[PDB]
Each structure stands twice: as C-alpha cells, then as structure tokens.
Amino acid sequence: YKIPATGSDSLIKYETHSTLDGRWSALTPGPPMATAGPADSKFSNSQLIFAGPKQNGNTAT
Amino acid sequence: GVGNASGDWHCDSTWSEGHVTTTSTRTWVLPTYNNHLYKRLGESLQSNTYNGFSTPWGYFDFNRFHCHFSPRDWQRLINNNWGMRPKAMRVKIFNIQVKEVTTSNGETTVANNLTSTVQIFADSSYELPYVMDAGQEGSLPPFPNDVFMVPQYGYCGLVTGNTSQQQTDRNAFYCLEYFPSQMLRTGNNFEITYSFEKVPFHSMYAHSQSLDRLMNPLIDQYLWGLQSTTTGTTLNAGTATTNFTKLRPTNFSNFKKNWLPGPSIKQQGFSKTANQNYKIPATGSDSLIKYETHSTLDGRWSALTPGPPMATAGPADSKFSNSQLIFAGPKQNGNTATVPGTLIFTSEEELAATNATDTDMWGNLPGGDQSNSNLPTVDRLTALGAVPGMVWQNRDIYYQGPIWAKIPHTDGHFHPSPLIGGFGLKHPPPQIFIKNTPVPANPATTFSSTPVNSFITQYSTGQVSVQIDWEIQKERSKRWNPEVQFTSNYGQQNSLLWAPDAAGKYTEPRAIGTRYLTHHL
Amino acid sequence: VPGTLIFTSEEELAATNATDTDMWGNLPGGDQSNSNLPTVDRLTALGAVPGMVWQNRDIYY
Amino acid sequence: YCGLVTGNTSQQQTDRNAFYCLEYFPSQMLRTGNNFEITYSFEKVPFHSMYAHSQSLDRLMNPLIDQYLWGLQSTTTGTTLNAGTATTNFTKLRPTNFSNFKKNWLPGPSIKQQGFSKTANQN
Amino acid sequence: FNIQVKEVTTSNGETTVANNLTSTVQIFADSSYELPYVMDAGQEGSLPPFPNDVFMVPQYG
Amino acid sequence: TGQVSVQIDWEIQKERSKRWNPEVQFTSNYGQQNSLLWAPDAAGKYTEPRAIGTRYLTHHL
Amino acid sequence: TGQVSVQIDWEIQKERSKRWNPEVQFTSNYGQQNSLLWAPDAAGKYTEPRAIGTRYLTHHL
Amino acid sequence: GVGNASGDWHCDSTWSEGHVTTTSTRTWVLPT
Amino acid sequence: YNNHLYKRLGESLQSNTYNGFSTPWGYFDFNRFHCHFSPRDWQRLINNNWGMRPKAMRVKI
Ligand SMILES: [Mg+2]
Ligand SMILES: [Mg+2]
Ligand SMILES: [Mg+2]
C-alpha cells in the first residue's frame, strides 16, 4: 500500500510501535519471532537488514 | 515489679556508612474487643461479598515509613542515597498497665488492676492470615507524642462465587488462644527480634535517560530499515517503491533497539475538574467499578489499583487514575471529599523514562495484513504482558506509604514487588497479637456448666518500641550539574508545616517519594 | 455420553487464578470525558504483569 | 518420534530433519540369565502444592479496618448514568467496599477458553 | 497459676469487686485416692472444648 | 479466678494396612453453610455440631 | 517377556496447619456397591472409577 | 509476686512418630 | 516391532501434518502416578501432606 515516509500518515504509524511518554518507537527488531526466509518476497521489522556489498549510499529502492 | 519501669523511651535515628537505624517508641491503648468473643463475619454484596472472623485480639502494625522516620530523616535519606532496604527489626512492648473500669451513679472511675494480665504472641511461623500488608490503618502514628489505639484483628476467608457469603468446607477458622502466648502482668515486658531476607534495594532515583534514547545521537546505525512504500507525502498516492534507508540521526524513533518498555494495562483517566468527566454513579449496574480497569476473580470485580508500575500524570496535573496513590490531605478528617485539593495525590511520572503511560497504551499494531489494496486498521495495544526484552521500574515508596507486603503463598508469581509499593517478602515481619486476659466478674454460688459471660471491664495501655536497621547505598554519580533535592520550600507560614499547629494537632502536609536523585540507564 | 468419562476440575484455583471460560477482566476502550463514555473492552488474554501470582494445575492419581 | 514439520501442508522433510538410529548407541545384550538395572536422581524441583487455598486473593485484608488510601467513588450524584450533578466524589477506602481496596497482587495470566455444555442441545 | 482472689462488696446501688492480694486458695491432689472419685461419672465440669471459653470450677460432692 | 494448663502425652499407633482400595475418612462435608461449623457463630457462640468417633479406618480380623 | 521393577523415593511435606475446624479429606464414600470399587470385579477386570487430585487440605494465602 | 505473672498461656499439639502431645489452657472462676 | 525395521513416517494433513520414524525398539514408561501408588497410598499421601516431589528412582528389568 502506498505509505509516505513523513506526515500524519507516515510509515511509523502503520508499523507496530511502542509508545514511551507519547513518543513512538518502531518495534524493531522486536521480540524473537519466526520471520520470512531471507530470500522470500516479504519482510518485516523483525528482520535485521545490512547494506549489501555494493551499497555505499544511505538509501536504496 | 509494680513500682519499677520495665523499659525506657527511645526515639532516635543513628546514621552511619551504608546504614541507618531508626528507633520509635509510642504509647498504645488496648480495649477489650468483641467483648472477649470471636464473631463470624459475612455479608452478601455482589463483588463486595466477604466472610471471615473478628477476633477479640488486637495487633501491632509498624508497616508505614513515617512510623520510623521523622520528616527530616526521610529528607536525609532521599537526598543522598540511591537505594535502601530493611535489614533487621526489634520490637519491645513494656510498661504494661491494666486498668479496671467501674460505673456508678455519676461518672465512671478507672483503677489499676495489678494482678491482671495481657497475652502476647508473635505469629512467627505465619500460621495465621497476614493482614499487616493491606494498606490499612492501625500502624504507629507518625508523631512520637501521639497515643494510638491497638487495631482489632480480623481476617477474611475464602469467598466462593460472587453473590453469597456462605462458607464451604474449605473455609478455615483460626482460634488464637490455640497458640502459645506470653502472659504479662504490670512488671513484665515482651521482646522480639527479626531479620529481613535479602531483598533488592528500592531504587531512590529517577532516570535521567529515556529507554528509546540510549544511542549516540551523532552516529548512524549499520542497520537498515524500510522508510516508506511510496514517493511523496500523501497516503495512497505517489509511485509505489520500497524506499530503504540506513538508520541515522534525527530518525531515532526508527532506530533498531535492544529493549522495550515494561508491561502495562490501560487505566481510565478522570479529571480533577468535575464537569470534565462523564457522569458515573457510585452504585447500580453502571457504577464506577464497571468503567474502571478491573480484574475478575471468581466472578467478582476488583478494581485494578494501584496496578502494575506505570508512568502516571504529574501530582499537580488536572487528571489522575487508579494508578495513583491518594492520601488524605492535612485538613481532611472525614472519610469522603468532593474537593481534590483536600487530598494528596502521588505520582509515578518519573517512570515515563522506561514504563508505558497508565492512561495511554503500550503502543499500536496492525489490525491485519496490508497490500496494494488493503490498508489495515491501527489497533491499540491497551494491555500487554511480559515480552522478552522488556524492562521497567517499580513504583516509588512514600514517607506515609507501606514498607513491606507478604508475597502470596502460591506456586507462581511474576516480579513479586507489591503493587502499592515496598518490599515483597516471603517471610515478612511477624504479626504481634495482644489481648486483655478476661477476668470473670462475681460468679453464682451454684455450679453451672454454661460458659462465663460476665466479666470485669478492663483495658490496658503501655509502650511499644520498634527499631529497624536499614541498609542504604549512597549515590555515586559523576553528574556535573546540581541534582533535584527534596527541600522545605513552603515560604512564609502562619504555622510551621511538619509541626503541630497552635491547637497541638500534627498533620502531614505533603506526600514525599524517594526519587529526587537521578541515575542514567 | 459424557457420563462414561471422568472430568477433572481446577475449581480450587478460583482463589488466585482467573476463570478459563470467563476473562481476566475489563478495561476502557478509550478515554472518557463529559461527552464520551468509552466501551468496556474485555481482557480475554493477558500475559505476565508485575504483581501477578497463580497456582499451577493439580496432579492426578 | 516426530521430526521437524515445515509449513502447514506438506510432510516433506528438509535438510534440518534428523534421523536417529538406535543401534548406533551402545546397549547391553541380555540372555535369559541376565538382568538390567539403572539408578536416577531427580534435580531439585519445587514441591507440588497439595492444598486448595482457604483465602481469596482479593480478600487478604482485615475486614474490620479502613485503608489510609483514598480513591474516586463516583463522578456524579445519584444512581443513574449520564445523570445527576457532575462532582468528583472521593472516599477513604473502608469495609464493605473491598472490591475497590488498593491491592498488592493480581490474579495470574490467562487465556480465554471456549465453554461447552455436557448437554448436547445447549451447544 | 495466675491466681486472683476477688473481694465482693455490696452497696446501695450495684456491687463492686476488688483484688484481695493477701487472700489464699487451697489446692491439693488426692494422689493416694483416699477420697471418693467422681471425675469418671460422665458428668459436667470438665474444661470447655473451646480455648476461649471461661468455665466455672464444679463443686465437689 | 486463674488459669489452668493441662498437657497430655498420648501414644499412638499408625495404621499399617495392606488394603488396596481407599479407606473411609472423617471429612468435613457439610457443604454450603451460612456459618462455618466447628466455629463460633455470628454471635460468638461455639457449639459442637456432631459426635465424632474414632472408627473410620478398618482392620481385618 | 520379563519383569520390570521401578522404585521411587518421594519427599513429602506434612501439613502443619493451625486451622481449628476439620479439613476436607478424600474418602471412600460410594455407599452400597454390588462390586467394591477400586477392586477387580466379578470377571476380574480392574478399573479406576474416579479421578483423584491432591487438593483436599487447605492453606491460607 | 503481685505484679509478675506466675505462668504463660499454652494451647498447642505436637505430633511426632507414635506420639502426640496436647496442651490446653483455660481460665476458670471459683466461687465460694 | 516393524519386523526389525525403521520406517520413515509422514502424512500431509494440514494442521495434523507430521513426519518422523517408527523404530523397531520398544521403551519403558513409568510416567503416571498410579504406576507407583495404590489408591489407598494416594489417599495417605493427599490427606496428610501439603507437598510432594520425586527424589530418586531405580529401575530393574
Ligand atoms: Mg501511621
Ligand atoms: Mg498457599
Ligand atoms: Mg467439656
């Protein structure tokens, strides 16, 4: 679904998050749970993502 | 003997390194309760249904901090130490005086009964229902000059269902005469020593760091995360694209973290301003207990209060909840009030550094699975139990609050820190029972097997000393700037606070917690 | 016919444990005000919370 | 023995599945005159509790004494909801209002189960 | 033990009781069985079953 | 008036039966009671509700 | 075919209650039975008629 | 003497192997 | 058993799906209370004790 990075409808809103003193903190990686395979077409905040060997910038599509 | 005191008065506090000993002496008065009888209690009141027994015995309660610390001593404690815990305890009951009361045509007259006794025993094996840890009255008064009445011992039994007080075969009856007890005449005294099991130090500090801000604000993470699923700033608009980003400064809310805020259960928030609340009656099918967070045990409702340690509203905020302890203010003598200003509200706002907020929620989570055609609802996580990686701080102890609680005799318990505050102990300070031994009045001169029910009217009085050794841990901070300190800052006062007024009445004007000093996470 | 079977019970656990077919309790569905009375939500499932105690189930012959 | 089941539709095993051959262990061989013996000690475990509680968790207080703690009793005057005069009615928590007493402990964790009747037509 | 001898005095109104510190009570056990034994006749006068009950010492006859 | 203490040492012999099935046992089985039996009532009066013998266990001849 | 012996040493902790009134006790109370329960029947078949837990005695919290 | 109790209250029962001791204390009143 | 063979087990049955092996071996199970206690012994245990736990075990074939 098309969810922007900023605004009232930013991604942090639709992602599982804890609330500490009114501030949102994305639940990530979160409690140990079974995730999708590393090669599956899906992922979540429960998975650690590292920069690949050809990733030098700080953003990627 | 008769003309020789069986003990002296002792009310000081000795401070040393890592230790402080409090000593408190008070005068007590013990009347004859239940007219020497045991009465079976019970009443069918829906969620208030209960059964049990009132006994003719009285008992001593030392379970409040102000019984042991003067306000100045409490200040010495909280402004300089990060932790404290009880270590040992010694109790003495002496200078016993049994009085005989006689009524005549005019006024009543009192006289010493030198041969009468009082019975005293400590339930050191915990064979009797423990009630000294229920946040109830009966403890030694905070002021050394005050004389108090020894509270009557009574206990509750098993309640079955949520409508009848009827007892079953499982209900127990405990006769206290069935225990061995010391009998004391005016010359005798009673003493008992007790050691506390090792318990963790109470944390007497507020955190100067937030759980979601434990990172170096200058460095990026080597971890990546999804930033958005479209281009632009509008929802359901733009070009679909999985935008990933290295997690770096000023996006702290999305940083990968190792720990989570502790468990929480949403409480209902009410305004101190009357017209800001919905109109909910005290009784009926729509009573307040219904709209307040409550647990259900065997069909009976029990308001969640104070409940699990959570961040609450400031003590001066316009709102409060059942998570906050409320004490009677200095001018509150009745048992009801419509003006919150006459009451003292405590607060656990310092807990916002690691604990979730009581009237808010632990967080949010998806109501379903999202896709290019389905945007799940944002569900609220109003209640959440222990999850791996959670951390939290217990609620604070107060000057006028409880010290210990008996951890329930059960197979399982999670974090046995009493919710009203204090130290959870498996073997708490033993209950000490006292009773005026019955003295039969003039009997008939013909034998009768009927139990005697005519007694001489009596009451006793004496002194009680309680000494507690406390272990304290001095703050050892490297903080450069000045800390917050509990300070006397009432300004000009017609009558000095924390002191008896012109009429001689002593009252506590404020609640004093223990969290002024700070500590990083 | 259930009469041919032997049913065990953990009714003695009602002294400290919640009832299995009931709920742990209730909590507000939202925030109340002079114009909003929140729904009374049911707490049908609840994990370990500080201050909880319970008895294990019984062993049988 | 059962092995690792992957997914919820196929019994197919993966490389993670293990096969254990018991002949691959050392064993005593016994003819009609031989016997086998083995001793074992249990680790320290808690005692099973062979008792029912004669007290309720929400009734651990002295039923004769008031609490020195206060609580909100109601937010209006009367007995009707959304009626009466708005007022923050506070009260000292005292006997026969045990449901509102401040307590130190809570009932343990729980997960709602479905209840069925032993009477057929009631389900 | 804990013997207390009370002196009773009557007046115009009610009667008053007072301790008589110098008065005695006499006690002896018929250890040689020289007196008629009556403690085994299924009669009243034994200590009451309830620990809190106060009883009247039965008259010997 | 005074106090009286009585202490009795009793010799007992435990049953040592080889009986396989459960024995009869004296048990509290009064069911629901407005006022717990073998306990003082609301007015504080203590009464014994039943006679209890000593023959629940069995022995062969 | 052969025999198998199993011996278990159990540690037990006696109840040490101060409760005054009688406790609930597991008791044989099946009344008149054509064939004694917890015993083989006329055909020699042995069956267990009831489930027996371990919670008859009580304890306060 | 006068202001000193000449005994204490004792009402328990101690169970052992092959033995049990009962202890009972009561208050009595003796008229003339 | 299995005619001396090891058979690979497995069946696709949705939530009942399973895989494994049946072996030609048998095994001894002592994991039930009634294997060790007679009904009368169980009664002796539960009517007089607040707690119990296993301490040691010895098996002979
Ligand atoms: Mg006090
Ligand atoms: Mg227990
Ligand atoms: Mg008698």
Numbering used by the authors:
A (entry chain A): 491 to 551
B (entry chain A): 214 to 734
C (entry chain A): 552 to 612
D (entry chain A): 368 to 490
E (entry chain A): 307 to 367
F (entry chain A), G (entry chain A): 674 to 734
H (entry chain A): 214 to 245
I (entry chain A): 246 to 306
Can you list sentences taken from the study reporting this PDB entry?
The AAV genome codes for three capsid proteins (VP1, VP2 and VP3). AAV5-like viruses interact exclusively with the polycystic kidney disease-like 1 (PKD1) domain of AAVR, while most other AAVs interact primarily with the PKD2 domain.
Here, a high-resolution cryo-electron microscopy structure (2.2 Å) of AAV serotype 4 (AAV4) is presented. In the current work, we focus on AAV4 since it is a serotype that is not dependent on AAVR for successful cellular transduction. Again, AAV4 does not appear to interact with AAVR. Refinement against the 2.2 Å resolution cryo-EM reconstruction brings appreciable improvement over the crystal structure at 3.2 Å resolution. The all-atom r.m.s.d. is 0.80 Å, 0.72 Å with flipping of pseudo-symmetric side chains and 0.48 Å for backbone only. As discussed in the following sections, VR-IV is key in blocking interactions of AAV4 with AAVR PKD2 and VR-VII is key in blocking interactions with PKD1, with the updated coordinates clarifying the extent of steric conflict. The VR-IV loop in the AAV4 clade has a conformation that is different from other clades; furthermore, residues Thr446–Asn449 in AAV4 are incompatible with the binding of PKD2. VR-VII differs in the AAV4 clade, with a fold in the native structure that would overlap with bound PKD1.
